[model samples]
Target: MNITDIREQFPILHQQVNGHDLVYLDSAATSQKPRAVIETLDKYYNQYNSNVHRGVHTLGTRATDGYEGAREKVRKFINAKSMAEIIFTKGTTTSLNMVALSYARANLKPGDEVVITYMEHHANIIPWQQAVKATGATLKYIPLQEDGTISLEDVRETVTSNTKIVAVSHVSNVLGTVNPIKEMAKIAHDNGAVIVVDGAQSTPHMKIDVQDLDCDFFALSSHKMCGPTGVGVLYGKKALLENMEPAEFGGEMIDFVGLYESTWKELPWKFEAGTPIIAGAIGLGAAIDFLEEIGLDEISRHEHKLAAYALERFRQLDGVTVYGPEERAGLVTFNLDDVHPHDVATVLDAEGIAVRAGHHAAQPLMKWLDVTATARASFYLYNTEEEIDKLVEALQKTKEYFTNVFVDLEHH
Candidate 1:
């Protein structure tokens, strides 16, 4: 793939920020929308702009077709077995909460354990905490190695016969560590537990096959994957979904209503109550079209190269602490010596280099890394090597500024 041609597709990359060309290294937070995705949203509102599923008008049919067509695209994107297996939600947070409150709450008992790791985002962590609290079940953490990577040995020891659910992140948003979802799924199944994968970070950078991984459920966020915000996907096996009850209750999810009794809709719609995200889902379909045309394998290769190059560049700098393992996804989380992560980010921003600085919604992982906060530079398909170089240049300047300030303070 030609990097120059790919970069041209995103209009946001053409602008200037703070007197310098914009360098977006914060794709982990939310990726920039391509013209195709933006146009799709605009065309939806301009052309159809109707509620889906019931109206008999022409625009209504188009809206429903676009919305349901998006669901099919997502099902194909993840290699899910059926369209009924995919449930569109507000985001990954709502999807995980559905599994926790609806599935885990009903299935777990006093001795049952829900296994996860410290590397999970808070969206994946707190739902299990609340679910286990309600069901009298125990929540267990599979301890990470010193390098912030999970050991399958620890997974074996942590997931016992009493384990009912094993939910984990496919890629760490903070550490950029990719978990072995296929192997973990086998372990979870061998112990009669259902595995739920948090795919918000992984779906954007790599291709995902839910059937190949054999995970029971996978949560995804559209905004993180070049699509619009407020739209996501929750994929579950058809058998399990058939047995689980609805997470939300309202109009669009009902089969029949009576004075004394009511019935729920079937499969995916059963979980998606009220009106769905019409424009968001359709825009997500356009994003999928854009990504599919570019090809995921090529994107993965490019990001791998980016990761290696960034790591080498950072190796040339001193007084910087890089977290996670030697092998990682296309993101780096670190802090400069004697400089707060927020300070590092502010300096980078002044140079028109956007990075994420905070706990990254992984406070437990922050505790494990022994840092209050960290700065992360994450890459996507549109990022380039020069941008990484700019990041390194900004970091060196940040370090020097802090170092000189400390010396002046000593003299004073």
Candidate 2:
């Protein structure tokens, strides 16, 4: 893939911020959309904007085709067995909650156990908290290694015969550590537990095959993968989805309605109630096409190299502390000397750099790292080594500038 052409497709990358060219390094939060995705959204609203699956008109047919077609795109993108397993929702957060509320609440009993790790995003953590609270189930945690990664031995220790659900992030949004979901899935299965994989960070940067991973459920967000916001997917095995009740009820997802009782739609539609995110799904389909054209493997390789280069450059800086194992995803989370991460990010912003600063929605992980917050610079397909060089230079400047200010204040 041509990096120049790829960068050109993202019109937002060609702009100036604070008198310098914009260097977007926050893709783990949300990716900048390509022109293809933007145009698809424009075409949908401009041409055929109507409700889906319930209308008989030409515009409605076009809309339904666009919406369901995106489901097929998602199924194939993750190599899911069928479109019936794919349920569209607001995003990964909604997807995970649906599983917790609809499936885990209904299935798990008082003595049952639900296992997760410390590195999960709040989206993955809070829902399970609510589920266990509602059902009187026990919530268990799988300990993280010192490098912020999980060990298989700990997986064996944490998951037991009484474990009903095992939920984990496929990649850590803060630590950038990629978990072995496939291996964990097997452990969960052997212990009679269902594995729920959070693919919000993984699906955007690397290839994902839910079937090969053998995960019972997987969740991902469209906005994290160059698509529009307010849309995502929940991929559950057909057997599991068929057994669970719909988390929502409304106009679009009903088969029949009686005064006292009602019946719902089948498989995926039951989970997707009301008017679905029509434009968002269409935009996601376009995003999938764009990513496939370039290939997921190519993107993964590019990011890995960029991350390694960033690590090397960051290590040369004095008083910088990087988190996670040496091998990681396309992001780095770190703290600089006595500088608050929010302050580091502020100075970087003045130099036209964008980075994420905070707990990254993982307060548990922050406690694990012994810091309240950290600065993160994440890479995507459009990022270059040259950008990493610029980032290093700006970071050095930030440290020097802050040090001088502190000295001046002390002398005063």
Candidate 3:
């Protein structure tokens, strides 16, 4: 994939941090914007700065076309059947809440069950918790294997006829485990349950097809995929969307207002209750084009290769332990012995490497991993083997630094 050239597209890579060269390995949390995406936004604000869908002038029409064109771009990127099936939200959280409040709350009852896994991010976990609480439905957790991947057998064992909603992640942000969502969806469907997938990690690093996966709903964030922040998507089957009422209510969602009641707008627009994320959507469209030009398969392959490279290098460091299965995509979540992740991340940042440090919003999985916290170095199309080399060297230094600190503590 010629990462040398690809890396050049991200101008942030050339900068310096804490007297060291910059190495950003936090793509899973959020990706650096490429020049094209930044330029696209600049062009929009510079040339056609107008509100979308409401204006009747030249700038308005242009803005509307650009805004709606972004939706079409997203609609095609995920291979959704129609625009009606796609709804834009603040991000993955909002999208998932839409499902929890609008779909799960409406459909679930006291005896119903909602199934998920131990590896879910809080975005995927908390909403369903609320859904179950509000609906008096039962929340079930499918146990993870020792290696962190959830098998199809686990799906079969956990889900039953009472399982009204089976929600799972497409990929584990911390474990880096790419799950079997397609098969999970099939099992959910066979059990007469709707499968909801958290695609925040998967959509950024992998190619996703709603039709191919047969998932009832898919939610993802655009910022994690090198697009602007404040934009995300929720994809649902048209039939299900038609039957579900929206969680939000306000101006744009209404069809007709009456003294006592009101009719709502149709499918997608009905969910978008207020002014939309216009500029962010435009940036996401540009990001989609940017990724498409490189090809998603190529991008996925690049990140996978980077993950393998980082994993291999990580093995050589003392006190370093890698998580997830042998096969993973784009991320290496691990920790060094005797060094808190926050400390490791702080030192790494001093070396100009930006990685994520925390529970990664997966407190349940973190509890299962039996750690207070961990550091994750995630990759993307623009990351390089040389960067992995720097990370490995930095880990060695981190180990030495912590050892010295503890030695000083003993002496004191």
Candidate 4:
């Protein structure tokens, strides 16, 4: 893929911030949408804006086609067996919660275990916490290696016959450590547990085959993969989804309603309760087309190179501490000695750099790292080596600026 041509597709990346060209290194938080996705959203609302699955009018049929068409795209994107497994939701958080609320809460009993890890985002953590609380189940954690990755032995030790569900991130949003979901799924299955994989960070950067992974459920956000916000998907095994009750009850989900009782729709629709994210889903379909045209392997390759380059540059600077194993995803989370992450982020922002500076919604991982927060610079297919050079220069400036401030204070 031509990097310059890829950069052109993202209009937002061409602008100036604080008098310097914008260097957006925060794709892990949310990827900038491409022109195709934006135009698809525009074409949708401008042409055929109507409710799906209810009306017999031409516009309604068009709208329904767009909505369901997106579902099919998602089904194929992850190589799921059928569209019945794909359920659209607000985002990864909402998707994970649906599994926790509808599946885990219903199936887990007292003395049952729900396994997770410290590397999980809050989206993956809080739902299981609530599930165990509601169902009287035990929530267990697989210990992390010192490098912030998981060991298969630790996974085996943590998961037992009592584990009803095992939840984990396919990639750590903070540590950038990619977990072995396929192997973990096998372990979970062997122990009679269903594996729930959080694909928020992984889905955007890598090719995901849920069937090959054999994960019971997978969740991802559209906004993190060059699509619009407020839309995501939950993929569950057909049998499991067919058995679980809907966490939400409303118009589109119900098949029949009486004064005293109501029956729900099948598979995916039952999980999607209301007038779904029509425009967002359409944009997601467009985004999938965009990614596929470029190829997921190409994107993964580009980001991997960027990550290695960033790691090499970071290690040359004194007083800078990088987190995670050497082999990681496209992001680098780190800290500058004597400088708070927010301060580092602020300085970088002044130089027209954008990065994530916080717990990254992984507070448990933060505690594991022994830091309150850290600065993260994540790369995407559109990002370049030139941007990494700018980041390195700005970081050097930050260190010098802070050191001078301390020197001035001592003299005073």
Candidate 5:
């Protein structure tokens, strides 16, 4: 990939921060959109500003086309059976909640189990806890190996006939450990359980095939993939969604409402209650176009290189502790000796380097890692090798600054 050309498409990369060129390494949290996405949103509001689906006017038809057209894009993106299976939501968290309550709540009964992992984000972790409690079922954990990866053996032992659901993230947002989803799915199916994959982290970086993975449900976030915020999707199997009830009940979802009884809409619409995020979904379609033009495999290769490069560069820095497995997606989570991650992030920000700090929405995983918080730098399609060097230099300076301060205090 021509990193320069790719970086040029992102106007945010051309700007300066605190008198220095900005280094955005927080794509895992929320990716910076390209010109294509921004222009699409602008063109959408200015040209066809109308509510979708229910209207007969020209603007309404255009808007509806844009919104549903975006669903078709996602359907193709994940290779789902039909566009009807892709249900839009607020984000990955929102998508999973529907799966938990709409699907799991009705499916499970007393003493059933839902298997999760310590490496899962809080979004992937919490809903199951709530779902199980509400349905009189139990939640179980698929323990992480020492290097923070899940073992296939552990999958075999943990998922049993009694396990109704096995929830897993395709990639650890914190550790960048890519779970073996295809194998895990087979394990779940063998025991009469279905796998639910949190694809928020993976969707942005790799080519996803839900059919190959055979995951019963997969969640995605647009904001993390250079799309606008307040939009995401839930991809469920046709057979399963056909049987599942809607988690929400309101306007758009209602097919017919009588005094005594009510029926919901079919397939995707049944789950989408109330007015949807019209522009956000439209913007996501543009984002998908942006991503596809560059190619998902190219993005994946770029980020993977960035991860390896960052890890290699970090090895030269002393008093730094890097977390996660060696081979990973384009992100690094680490801590400086005797230095809080917040402080490290603060110093990096001074150099116009943006990073993420704190629990990373993985408090349970934090407990397993035995660290309160860590700093993170996540790469994307637009990131460059020089940025990794800048990060290492910033880290060295941070370590030196702290060391000098400590020495001065001892003298006093």
Candidate 6:
């Protein structure tokens, strides 16, 4: 794929941090915006700066076209049933909350259980907790294997007839384990439960097909996939969406308003109440085009190589403990002996390397792993082997730096 050539497209990778070349390895938090995505936003604000949907002006039409076009792009990106089935959200958190508030609250009862895993991000865990609290339902977690992957047999045991909703992440942000959502969805359906798949970690690294997965609901963030921030997606089955109400209410989402009561809009509009993120969605559409031009398969292959190479290189370092299974997605999570993740991250930052440190919004999983915190190195299409080497060298330096600091403390 000539990834070395592709790396030139992202201008930030060439810059200096702390007198060293910047090595960005934190794609999991949010990827750096490509030139295409940046130019897209610039072109929109420079050319057609207007509100979408109802304006009669030329800029309005163009704006609406760009915004709605992004929706179509997202529909195709996830292979969703229809554009109407995709809702533009603030991000993955809001999308999951919509499912819990709009769907789960209505369906769950006193004895109903919502199933998830210990490995879920806080976004997935908190929403279901809110749903269970509101509806007086029980929340069940499928335990993870020693290797950090969830077993389908445990899933089968966890998902009983009383389980009305099963929510899980497609890929672990911290562990990098690619979950068996397709198989889990099948089990959920067999037990008469709807599955909510979190795609925030998966959408950036691979192609997703909602129909093939057969999950009732899916959510992802646009910023993770080379797009702008403040934009995300929530995909729901049309039948399920029809029965649920919007989590927020105000202008734009109402059908008919009266003094006391009103009707809701159709499909996705019912859920998106406030004025939408027009520019963000337009940028996301351009990001989709940018990704498609390069091809997702090619992107996935590059990241796989990055992950494997990083694993091999980093494992040779002393005092570093890597987490997750041998088989993983496109990232690695680990901690250094006697060094807190925050401290490691600070040292890496001094070396012009970027990494995510802490619980990564997965406190339950952090506790399950029996650690206070950890650091993660995530990769995307634009990254290359040179950058990974930089990270490995920086990690070795981090170990030496922390060891010296500890020795100094002991002498003091």
Per lDDT, the best of the predicted structures is 2
Q: Can you give the lDDT of residue 34 in candidate 2?
A: 92
Question: What Cα-based lDDT does every candidate model obtain?
Answer: 0.94, 0.94, 0.92, 0.94, 0.93, 0.91
Which stretches of candidate 4 lie above 4 Å from their native place?
Answer: none
> Runs in model 5 with CA error above 4 Å?
none
Tell me the tens digit of each residue's lDDT in model 5 across 1-412.
Answer: 7899988888988878888899999998999999999999999989997988966899999999999999999999899989989999999999999999888999889979999999999899889999998999999999989988999999999999999999999999989999999999999999999899999999999999998999999999999999999999999999999999998889898889999889998989999999899999999999998889989999899888889999999988888988889979899999999788999999899899999999999999899999999999999998988999999999999999999999999899
Q: Could you tell which candidate, 2 or 3, scores higher by lDDT? A: 2
Which run of 10 residues does model 4 get worst, by summed lDDT? 265-274
In candidate 2, residue 268 scores what lDDT? Answer: 82
Q: Which digits, one per residue and each the tens of the lDDT, describe model 2 over residues 204-264?
A: 9999999899999999999999999999999999999998999988877788999978899
- Against the true structure, candidate 4 reaches a TM-score of 0.99
Q: At residue 335, what lDDT does model 3 achieve? A: 87
lDDT of 6 by residue, 1-412 (tens): 7877778788878898899888888999999888999999999999997988786999999998898888999899889989889999999999999999989999999999999999999999998998999999999999999999999999999999999999999999988999999999999999989999999999888889999999899999989999999999999999999988888999989999999999998877888887799899999888889888898888888788888888899788888899999888889999988788998898899888899898899999989999999999899988888888888888888788778888999999
Clashing residue pairs, backbone N/CA/C < 3 A, model 1: none
Taking all chains together, each candidate's TM-score versus the true structure is: 0.99, 0.99, 0.98, 0.99, 0.99, 0.97
Residue 43 displacement in candidate 5 (angstroms): 0.7
Q: Candidate 1, residue 97: CA error in Å? A: 0.3
State the lDDT of candidate 1 residue by residue for 1-412, as single tens digits.
Answer: 8889988889989988999999999999999989999999999999898999986999999999999999999999999989999999999999999999889999999999999999999999999999999989999999999888999999999999999999999999888899999999999999999999999999998999998999999999999989999999999999999999998888999999998777999888998898899999999999999999999888889999999999999989999989988788899999897899999999999999999899999998888888999999999999999999999999999999999999999999
lDDT of 4 by residue, 182-209 (tens): 9999999999999999999999999999
Supply candidate 3's per-residue lDDT for 11.
91
| Per-residue C-alpha lDDT of model 3 across residues 50-140, encoded as one tens digit per residue | 8887878999889889988998999999999999999989999999999999899899989899999999999999999998999889999
Lowest lDDT 10-residue stretch of candidate 1: 259-268
- Candidate 5 local lDDT, residue 211: 89
**CA RMSD of all predictions:** 0.9, 0.8, 1.2, 0.8, 0.9, 1.3
